[PDB]
Amino acid sequence: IVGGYTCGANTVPYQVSLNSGYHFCGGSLINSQWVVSAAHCYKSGIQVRLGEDNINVVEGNEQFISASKSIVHPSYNSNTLNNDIMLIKLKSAASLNSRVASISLPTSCASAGTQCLISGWGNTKSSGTSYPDVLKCLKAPILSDSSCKSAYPGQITSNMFCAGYLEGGKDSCQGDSGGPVVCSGKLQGIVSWGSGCAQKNKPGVYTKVCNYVSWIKQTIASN
Numbered sequence: 517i518v519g520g521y522t523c524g525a526n527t528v529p530y531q532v533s534l535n536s537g538y539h540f541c542g543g544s545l546i547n548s549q550w551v552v553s554a555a556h557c558y559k560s561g562i563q564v565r566l567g568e569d570n571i572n573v574v575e576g577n578e579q580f581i582s583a584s585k586s587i588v589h590p591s592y593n594s595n596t597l598n599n600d601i602m603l604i605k606l607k608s609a610a611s612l613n614s615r616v617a618s619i620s621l622p623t624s625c626a627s628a629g630t631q632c633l634i635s636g637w638g639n640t641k642s643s644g645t646s647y648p649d650v651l652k653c654l655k656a657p658i659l660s661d662s663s664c665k666s667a668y669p670g671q672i673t674s675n676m677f678c679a680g681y682l683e684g685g686k687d688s689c690q691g692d693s694g695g696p697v698v699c700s701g702k703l704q705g706i707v708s709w710g711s712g713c714a715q716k717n718k719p720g721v722y723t724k725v726c727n728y729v730s731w732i733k734q735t736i737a738s739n
């Protein structure tokens with residue numbers, strides 16, 4: 517997260533860290549047994565870490581639970597990151613509390629200009645590299661599709677939207693991958709891609725979760 521602020525401990529209780537010896541991606545709790553992340557975050561041997569603030573210090577509200585299965589979207593395309601969504605099942609149900617809470621799936625999409633919350637343990641610099649140990653937050657609006665497509669011609673699908681600031685300086689970044697974009701109390705986006713971080717006229721691109729709600733609901737009821 518570049519240009520954001522410290523969220524504050526467990527102020528984003530649906531935010532998870534995916535860990536395989538180390539944090540490698542964000543995720544969102546959507547019920548006690550299931551997480552939503554990005555397809556480009558797929559790998560075996562995943563441990564889900566909930567209740568986290570400082571990811572390098574055990575502060576007392578953590579729950580560490582291994583993944584029993586992962587389901588990348590059937591239509592994911594690694595070349596273009598179209599349908600960049602994945603579901604991860606917990607081997608045991610998370611114990612939900614104020615610190616470890618699920619985020620609601622959207623009933624409908626969000627419109628351009630809607631303010632959202634983007635969060636993660638990703639890089640905080642526009643040039644160079646600095647990883648925070650505490651959770652960073654960023655308020656950012658959903659941008660119009662035309663400004664999104666103008667920035668990334670021939671690369672944006674109906675399954676993607678841009679959010680952020682065309683002037684730059686505020687954006688998500690590497691290590692934020694898979695993380696939530698929350699608008700009006702719903703999970704509308706997943707941190708997917710972009711050119712650099714916080715670069716002018718290069719806004720962040722997010723997986724459009726509202727297109728996947730039936731697939732999400734169908735998949736977890738059958739797995």
Ligand SMILES: N=C(N)c1ccc(CNC(=O)[C@@H]2CCCN2C(=O)CCC2CCCC2)cc1
Nearest residue numbers: 556595596688689690693708709710712713720
């Ligand atoms: N500036 C941002 N908002 C932002 C946030 C998070 C990321 C992390 N994502 C990534 O690094 C993903 C993973 C595979 C290649 N990749 C890219 O961003 C490269 C460009 C992609 C590859 C294919 C279509 C465009 C990248 C950018």
Ligand SMILES: [Ca+2]
Nearest residue numbers: 570573574575
């Ligand atoms: Ca911790």
